[PDB]
Design a protein around this ligand. Structure first.
Ligand SMILES: OC[C@H]1O[C@H](O[C@H]2O[C@H](CO)[C@@H](O)[C@H](O)[C@H]2O)[C@H](O)[C@@H](O)[C@@H]1O
Ligand code: SF4
Ligand code: SF4
Length: 294
């Protein structure tokens, strides 16, 4: 029986309903719906600024790697690249009227640049169509290919996100051995080197056995790498094959880590059991970076 802080009420807001109705006549899938995310009523217009945030996966909604913690659907092979997806997806997002979109993609080992040009093309169409829409790219590490990272970071996005997922001592238990903490930090550093204007962001999951000393040291290492924004949320086991949850971190302990993030100087620290990288991302951006007056 899950603790009650991992549950939400059914989404019922006026803004949620309007976004939901409009989406149904568009040709566009969201992670929000596909993953049955409990946060949809809050992200789709439910917050203080009434912003609409959603997450859209580019280059297919499955991954072949089968990582031990990951909730993305597994498939034995990658799907084909749709050359019309950058144009069509940018068009649909702009018509839908999101305020903040997280464009995300899985590890595409089949492509030399990991999909970086395809991602950058999508950002470029979207920013040409509606420069008011904020754009975050949440990407894999591109095997540390600095040119692929540069392609995404120069694309015109607002936020470059790349997740470290756990503390260094748990990387081999949790993440695939093709990735690691140092390489992920080098991604974030390189994005800021080539585009110093971009906001850098990472996310970590708690509940995988990390201790407080390890979490704090990780947060300090991220500040040293000039990471602007951080999210911390609960690891939820997708199926019985995936890693067991070591513990459900309490609501107040997540609030402690928010305080720690504030003190270490992150521009925002989104922290809570249901947090993930995209959770209310447009609201965190407007409140904490833009400082928008209501
Ligand atoms: O806000 C002033 C400008 O800051 C940036 O431009 C400076 O920093 C760039 C590297 O990030 C340099 O290439 C540039 O020559 C500097 O002027 C920003 O990119 C500009 O858009 C701003 O106008
Ligand atoms: S963490 Fe990334 S590489 Fe691993 S299964 Fe998930 S999407 Fe694929
Ligand atoms: S947390 Fe992310 S995936 Fe979930 S509803 Fe919000 S934007 Fe969508």
């Amino acid at each position: 029986r899950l603790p009650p802080w991992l549950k939400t009420e059914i989404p019922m807001g006026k803004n949620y309903n309007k976004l939901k109705n409009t989406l149904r006549n568009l040709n566009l899938h969201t992670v929000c719906e596909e993953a049955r995310c409990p946060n949809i009523g809050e992200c789709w217009g439910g917050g203080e600024y009434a912003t609409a945030t959603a997450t859209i996966m580019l280059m297919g909604d499955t991954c072949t790697r089968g990582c031990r913690f990951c909730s993305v659907k597994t498939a034995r092979n990658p799907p084909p690249l749709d050359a019309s997806e950058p144009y069509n997806t940018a068009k649909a997002i702009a018509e839908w009227g999101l305020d903040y979109v997280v464009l995300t993609s899985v590890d595409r080992d089949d492509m030399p640049d990991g999909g970086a040009e395809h991602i950058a093309k999508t950002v470029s169409y979207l920013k040409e169509r509606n420069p008011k829409i904020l754009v975050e790219c949440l990407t894999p590490d591109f095997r540390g290919d600095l040119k692929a990272i540069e392609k995404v970071a120069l694309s015109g996005l607002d936020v470059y996100a790349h997740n470290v997922e756990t503390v260094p001592e748990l990387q081999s238990k949790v993440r695939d051995p093709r990735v690691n903490f140092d390489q992920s930090l080098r991604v974030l550093k390189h994005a800021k080197k080539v585009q110093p204007d971009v906001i850098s962001k990472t996310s970590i999951m708690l509940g995988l056995g990390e201790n407080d000393e390890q979490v704090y040291a990780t947060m300090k290492a991220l500040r040293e790498a000039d990471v602007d924004c951080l999210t911390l949320g609960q690891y939820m086991q997708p199926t019985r094959r995936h890693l067991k949850v070591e513990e459900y971190i309490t609501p107040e302990k997540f609030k402690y880590w928010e305080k720690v993030g504030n003190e270490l100087g992150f521009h925002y620290t989104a922290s809570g059991p249901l947090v993930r990288s995209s959770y209310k991302a447009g609201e965190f951006f407007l409140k904490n970076l833009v400082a928008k007056r209501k």
